[PDB]
């Protein structure tokens, strides 16, 4: 799990460490890397068009166009995250990074996608955006994951990106925040993950103050220690607090 901090083009140290990582991970490692590096007839990958809301689109079609765009960039399986995201940086600067991702047009992981999703939905006030972070346990280790929760016309859904199809986008059909979270919990268990912690942020402002960051953990729930009824109780109370702007 490396992160590219050298910008673009990627510098030598970052580039070579990526290649050594994949050489090690892949069973046919050295043969594989030699087949790609300096290969002479590599396809030039096409550059997908950035989605942009039009009055001629329904909101679900527009958000599906956003999710399809992220799928076209692809989930980043190389081990090197290509765009650095510093989570407490002001939104103003994060939006410059999101713009950069649409320009360089490379594979992305879960945090990059949350930032992209904010960038691509800014300016449509009928959509409210808030991050949902998961801490899970699987065979001896803790894993971290984040998606963009959305609320629109009285329904919850999400956008996101993951190595799993069930841990990302959810359609606008959940009637409560609890139903959305419990769907993530039930999906996680298909993969023998136990959810240890759920964190809900605040609504991401469409017009943030110059210095305003994303708030990632307004609500933090140690879910593995609580019963279903207590979890839903807390989620519903926080969600109504959000919807009221309390």
């Amino acid at each position: 799990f490396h992160v590219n901090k050298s910008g673009f083009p990627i510098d030598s140290h970052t580039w070579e460490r990526m290649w050594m990582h994949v050489a090690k991970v892949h069973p046919k490692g050295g043969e594989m890397v030699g087949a790609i590096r300096n290969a002479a007839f590599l396809a030039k990958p096409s550059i997908p068009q950035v989605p942009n809301y039009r009055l001629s689109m329904t909101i679900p079609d527009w958000l599906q166009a956003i999710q399809n765009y992220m799928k076209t960039l692809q989930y980043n399986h190389t081990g090197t995250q290509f765009f650095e995201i510093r989570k407490m940086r002001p939104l103003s600067g994060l939006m410059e990074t999101a713009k950069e991702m649409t320009r360089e047009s490379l594979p992305i992981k879960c945090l990059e996608a949350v930032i992209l999703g904010i960038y691509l939905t800014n300016g449509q006030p009928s959509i409210e955006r808030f991050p949902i972070s998961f801490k899970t346990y699987f065979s001896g280790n803790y894993f971290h994951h984040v998606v963009l929760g959305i609320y629109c016309n009285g329904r919850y859904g999400s956008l996101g990106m993951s190595r799993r199809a069930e841990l990302m986008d959810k359609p606008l059909t959940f009637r409560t925040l609890s139903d959305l979270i419990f769907d993530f919990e039930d999906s996680y268990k298909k993969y023998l993950h136990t959810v240890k912690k759920v964190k809900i942020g605040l609504y991401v402002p469409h017009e943030p103050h110059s210095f305003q960051p994303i708030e990632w953990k307004q609500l933090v729930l140690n879910v593995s220690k609580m019963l279903r009824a207590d979890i839903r109780k807390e989620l519903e109370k926080y969600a109504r607090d959000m919807r009221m702007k309390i």
Binding site: F8, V22, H26, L42, A43, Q74, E104
Partner: protein, 36 residues
Amino acid sequence: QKSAQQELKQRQRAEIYALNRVMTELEQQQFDEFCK
């Protein structure tokens, strides 16, 4: 200057997507060893 680096950016992008295809297929095969 700002031209040799564009050539390098594009070269790196083509190799990144070739690499990502191979790694995606490997994860899909290891994940299938899990589901089986």
